[PDB]
Subunit: 121 residues, 4 copies
C-alpha cells in the first residue's frame, strides 16, 4: 500500500507525479506536467484505499491538481481516478477529467477527458 504508491512516477507524456501515501489513506505531493498551461510544480491532494484486497486486484486511488502555483494560473483542475498495480512492472493506470472555469454559456465545453499511465521508470 503505502510502500508501493509513495514516491516518483512518470506518465506517457513525460509529466512527473511525486506523491506520499498516508497510512490512513491520505495522498499528498506535487505535480509537474509536460504539456498544457503549466510550469513547475503544483500542489496535489487525494486518497487511496489503505486496506486493499488480497485477490490480486489493484489499489483504488484518486488525486486532484488545481492548476495555480507561484508561476501561473490556468483556472482549471484535473482529477485522476485509477488503481495502483504492484509487481514487476508497477503501474498506476488512470483516467482523468480537466474542468476549466467557464461562463455558464461554455459550460458544455468545460471538461476534457483522458488517460495517463504512470510507471516508476
Amino acid at each position: 500500500d503505502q510502500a508501493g504508491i509513495t514516491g516518483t512516477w512518470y506518465n506517457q507524456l513525460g509529466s512527473t507525479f511525486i506523491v506520499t501515501a498516508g497510512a490512513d489513506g491520505a495522498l499528498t505531493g506535487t505535480y509537474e506536467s509536460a504539456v498544457g498551461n503549466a510550469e513547475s510544480r503544483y500542489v496535489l491532494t487525494g486518497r487511496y484505499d489503505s486496506a486493499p484486497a488480497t485477490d490480486g486486484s489493484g489499489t483504488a486511488l484518486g488525486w486532484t491538481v488545481a492548476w495555480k502555483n507561484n508561476y501561473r494560473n490556468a483556472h482549471s483542475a484535473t482529477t485522476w481516478s485509477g488503481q495502483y498495480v504492484g509487481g514487476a512492472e508497477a503501474r498506476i493506470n488512470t483516467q482523468w477529467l480537466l474542468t476549466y472555469g467557464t461562463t455558464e454559456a461554455n459550460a458544455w465545453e468545460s471538461t476534457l477527458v483522458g488517460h495517463d499511465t504512470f510507471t516508476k521508470v
Copy 2:
C-alpha cells in the same frame, strides 16, 4: 470565493458533501453517499482555484473520496471534477470518475463515469 465554497452541498441523489475551502486552494471535508456500497461519512480532500477570473467564469475544483471508513471498504475511489458557480442559485457542477480495484483481466471495466450537480438546497 472561500466563503461561497465552504459548507454543506447536496447532489441530485441526496448525497451530502461537507467541504471546507482553505485560502491556499485546499479542499477538506467529508462525503456521504446516498447510493452504492457506502455508509456514513467518508473523508475527502481536493483543490480549487483560489484566484478564479473576474469575468463571470466559474471556479475550477476537484476532490477525491476513497470509499473506506471505520464501517466498510468498497475498494474504490471517486474523483469529482467541475466548477463552482456562485450567486443566487449557486451550484457545484461535476462530472465524476469511480475506479474500483480489479484484476488485470478486469481493468477494462474498472471505471464508472457520471455527473453530479450540487446545490446548497
Copy 3:
C-alpha cells in the same frame, strides 16, 4: 420501443436531435447543435437495444455525429451514450465524448466529455 425512440428530441442546450429507430436496432437521423462550431443539420447514425429487458430498465443506445455538412467542418466527432426511459416523462439520458482531430503533441487534449439529457418537450 421503436415508436418511443423515433421522433424529435431536445437536449438542455436547445439542440435538436431527429432520429428514426429501425426494428433491427439501428439509429439514423440528423442532429443540430445550438452551440459550438456547427450550423444546420448534421447526419447521425447509431444503434440501440431492440430487445431491452421488461423490468423497468432503460434502453441502451448510442449514436455518432461527424461535424461536417454542406456548410462547415469542425474536424470533430461526438458520440452520445446513454439510455432511453419511456413513459409519462420520457427522456434520453446521455453522457457524450467529442474528439477533434489534433496533432500528436495535441492528442492529450483532443477530447471533451459531457452529458446531455434529451426530452420530448
Copy 4:
C-alpha cells in the same frame, strides 16, 4: 481518409473491429470483443470526418455497438470516440462509454469509461 480507416483493426484487449469508411463519412461494419458479455460479431455504425485537415492532425471519427446479436443481448451499448492517425504506425486512438440499461435507481452506475487503441497489427 476512406483508404486509411477502411478495414481490420485490433485493440489492446484483442478485440477485432472491421469497418468500412463511406465516401461521405459513413462508418459501417462489425465488432467482436475479447471481453465482456459478448460473443461473435455485432453490428456497428457511426461517422468520421471525410474532409480532414492537412496540418498533420488526426481524423476525427466515432462509432457505436449495441451489444445484441443472434447469440446474446447484453442490454448495453458503447460508443467509441477518437481520431485516426495515418503514417508508419497507423492508429485509431479512442475513449469509450459503455451505458447499460438500468432502472432509474441505478442510473448513477450505468456508464463505464475507458480507452481502446486500435492498430493494423
